[PDB]
Request: fold
Amino acid sequence: SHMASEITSLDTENIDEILNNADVALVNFYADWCRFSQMLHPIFEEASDVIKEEFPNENQVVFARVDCDQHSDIAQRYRISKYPTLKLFRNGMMMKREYRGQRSVKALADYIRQQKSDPIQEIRDLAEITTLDRSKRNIIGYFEQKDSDNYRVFERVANILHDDCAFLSAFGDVSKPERYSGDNIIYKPPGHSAPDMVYLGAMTNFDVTYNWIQDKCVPLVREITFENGEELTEEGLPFLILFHMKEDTESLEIFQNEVARQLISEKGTINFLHADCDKFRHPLLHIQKTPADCPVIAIDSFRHMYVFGDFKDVLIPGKLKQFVFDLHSGKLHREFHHGPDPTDTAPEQAQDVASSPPESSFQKLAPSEYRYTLLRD
Ligand SMILES: [Cl-]
Reply:
């Protein structure tokens, strides 16, 4: 059973050339027998027509498809774990974020439109840097001229990483006070206690400039939102989460510092995250917490949820590390059923609870069997 399409089907021979030449490429990884791929097929067909009218130039937007049953080598090459999967490429480079939005013609076309727009904000006067929103990260390029090899590298990097960080540009007499060294790039971390970080590589070198900028864009503890929730679950690690009100920035700072202090050993075993408690009231209900109880630290193993004792305890050395260790050892699961493990210097005896710890809430944000063919479980 195959459904006809006018979109280019990739195989082992043509894939590298087609992906490398396309400034932007949207690639549908599908299987004939996936009912969700089947429903997406006509929508993907019409979206490519809408986009090719808006973007008809030689290589500016290219829709393509991969039959993952016939080309299992290609599917594994791009770590396809579900159908349908919509990957975005840029000059052959696979973007971290997949399209996970609504499956409609308008939504797909809008995504391309948004991706093709200019993400860099041009500053008009250097006093805008003083008024800069320091809740976010910011990367600022000071250039002599927009028509330069230096800017074209910056432009390319910004196109890749705009969803991760705000990119700002300054030109001419506006930027000349900051260009005694020539063109330069500056990273401004969140908060007013962190000093600037300057890029000392060659701004004509894409690989090096991208690598330095990308390194600044990825926080140690990422914020989980509805937008990135699926992607975060696909990293296959349990969640260690700080639930906090958006305004209370000191709990986050405290949390990030202790993760950096104690949990570097746990880099590839548990995912460090923080979450706006008012947007995540329903997950908090799984553990019977409300924004009133925040800051709240919890683990979600994608089978159960466990609560950290008290946020203050994160100051006590070793406690946070121990909380992670107790997950992997099954101690957290045991202490729910039987109370805290007695020791000789600290036990009255708690009631036994035969029923299970709270169910996972972030499993609900993982790629769903109700809209994908899932390959992993
Ligand atoms: Cl567990």
Remarks:
- The pocket of chloride ion is lined by residues 301, 303-304, 333 (CB under 6 Å).
- Residues 119-219 form a domain with the Glutaredoxin fold (CATH 3.40.30.10).
